Amino acid sequence: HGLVPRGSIPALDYNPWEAIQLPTTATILDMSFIDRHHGWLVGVNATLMETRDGGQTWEPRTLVLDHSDYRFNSVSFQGNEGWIVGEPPIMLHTTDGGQSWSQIPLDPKLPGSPRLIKALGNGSAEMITNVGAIYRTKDSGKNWQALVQEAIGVMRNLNRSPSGEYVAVSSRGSFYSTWEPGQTAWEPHNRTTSRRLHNMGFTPDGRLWMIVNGGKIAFSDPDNSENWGELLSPLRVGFLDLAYRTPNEVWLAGGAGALLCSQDGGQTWQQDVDVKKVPSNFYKILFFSPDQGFILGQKGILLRYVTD
Amino acid sequence: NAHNFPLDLASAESAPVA
Numbered sequence: 224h225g226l227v228p229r230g231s232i233p234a235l236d237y238n239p240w241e242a243i244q245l246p247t248t249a250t251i252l253d254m255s256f257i258d259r260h261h262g263w264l265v266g267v268n269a270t271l272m273e274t275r276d277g278g279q280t281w282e283p284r285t286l287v288l289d290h291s292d293y294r295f296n297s298v299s300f301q302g303n304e305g306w307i308v309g310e311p312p313i314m315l316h317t318t319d320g321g322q323s324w325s326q327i328p329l330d331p332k333l334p335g336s337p338r339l340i341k342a343l344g345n346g347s348a349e350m351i352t353n354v355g356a357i358y359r360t361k362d363s364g365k366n367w368q369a370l371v372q373e374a375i376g377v378m379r380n381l382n383r384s385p386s387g388e389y390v391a392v393s394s395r396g397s398f399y400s401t402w403e404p405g406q407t408a409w410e411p412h413n414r415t416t417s418r419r420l421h422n423m424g425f426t427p428d429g430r431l432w433m434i435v436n437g438g439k440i441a442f443s444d445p446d447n448s449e450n451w452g453e454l455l456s457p458l459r460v461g462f463l464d465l466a467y468r469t470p471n472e473v474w475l476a477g478g479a480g481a482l483l484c485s486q487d488g489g490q491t492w493q494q495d496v497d498v499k500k501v502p503s504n505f506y507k508i509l510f511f512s513p514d515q516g517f518i519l520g521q522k523g524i525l526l527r528y529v530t531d
Numbered sequence: 532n533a534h535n536f537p538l539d540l541a542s543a544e545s546a547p548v549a
Contacts, residue, residue: 286548315548325545332537356536367540375533 225480225499232458235484238497239531245272245281245523252519254278255300255342256511257320264525265295265307273321278517278527286315286324296337301344306364308337308350316364327364339381353377355391355400355409373408374400382424390431396420399433415451416441422463427470432489434462440475442489457483457492466508468516468528476505476518482526498526 227234245251249270256262262274264281269291272281295309300320307315314327314337329337335352342348349359350367355374358367378391378400388403393411396419400409414420418435426432431443433451438460444450462477475483475492480499483492498505503520510516516528 284549288548314542316545323547324549326548327545328543330537330540330542332540334534334536354534356534358540364545365542367542369536369538369540371536372538373533373535 224502225496227494227496227499231494231496232483233493234496235493237531238495239528240482240495240498240518240526241529242498242501242520243279243281243525243527245525246283247272247523249523250519250521251523251525252295253297253507254509254517254519255298255305256515257300257303257305259512259515261320262511263298263300263305263321265298265309267294269293269295269309271295271307277515278525284321288313288326297339299340299342299348301342304342304344304346304348304363306340306342306348306350308340310336310338312336314340314350314364318363330367333358335377338378339383341383349387351378351381351389353379355402357389357402370404371402371406371409375409375411380422382422384425388425390423390425392420392423396436399423412449416454421461422465424465427467432465434465436461438462438477440465440489455489457485458494463504463506464508466510466516468510469513474508474518476508478504481505482518501526 249266249268251266254264260277271284274281293309298307303320305317312329315324317324334356335354338353339351346363347361355378357370360367377394392399400411402409422434439454441451464476471488473485482495482498485492503524507519514530518526
């Protein structure tokens with residue numbers, strides 16, 4: 224499996240990723256860690272699993288819900304306080320590291336369905352819905368206040384910056400929108416390529432990155448977050464996520480076992496050929512530290528970063 | 532489609548699920 228022919232892009236000398244099969248065929252959608260060893264992952268069909276060895280092994284945790292059809296979209300821990308949101312609207316909360324969980328009934332006025340929750344610690348969190356509504360709680364989810372008043376269309380692939388900014392691609396990739404605290408509305412931006420936008424996020428140096436249709440990426444101008452550099456073609460395949468491990472080491476995950484690494488901040492790319500054996504799209508890269516990282520696949524497949 | 536969002540939400544009391 225995964226034999227790559229001569230003439231491909233240069234190969235990485237080393238493979239730091241190990242494939243793990245979870246005790247499920249459910250697709251995993253998000254993961255969050257309390258500390259270096261204790262973490263949680265969530266996915267489709269209300270899948271919830273816990274690790275206590277840093278993600279080498281995972282155990283399912285039983286929940287008693289009214290049904291098991293929920294898609295758990297996002298999980299976030301800050302210390303022992305953890306939150307999960309999913310669709311159709313559901314929110315779960317823990318204050319003891321996930322020993323016990325409570326369902327927080329969501330106000331039926333909630334606009335759209337939850338797509339992301341961010342734990343801020345000590346009773347605070349913010350939640351974003353697929354229509355770009357943003358709500359903050361400070362009292363463990365009893366009350367929520369809107370942080371934005373207005374938006375356009377359905378958002379996709381929400382990403383949050385270290386300072387609490389958000390960027391989102393529209394549901395058809397025709398444009399993207401940004402928001403930062405104090406804005407009453409998202410601000411939409413026209414895309415700069417013919418190719419439809421698939422995903423966008425933040426670099427560790429205050430820029431945006433974007434993945435566009437046809438296996439191309441680009442980075443915004445440091446002088447001007449609204450000017451974009453030249454389109455790059457890492458593989459000369461569609462890409463699904465991009466994530467930094469360090470300021471200069473970038474990983475780029477795509478369909479059918481495609482996984483590339485750049486050690487020069489995105490200038491040149493090398494293929495991790497070893498993971499091409501694994502029969503899965505790579506949907507999402509999560510680095511929790513320079514040493515600890517996971518890639519979410521299908522059918523209960525994860526890749527785990529081993530420090531080497 | 533433009534949307535205008537409720538400014539405040541409130542949650543009923545939580546129920547244990549685990």
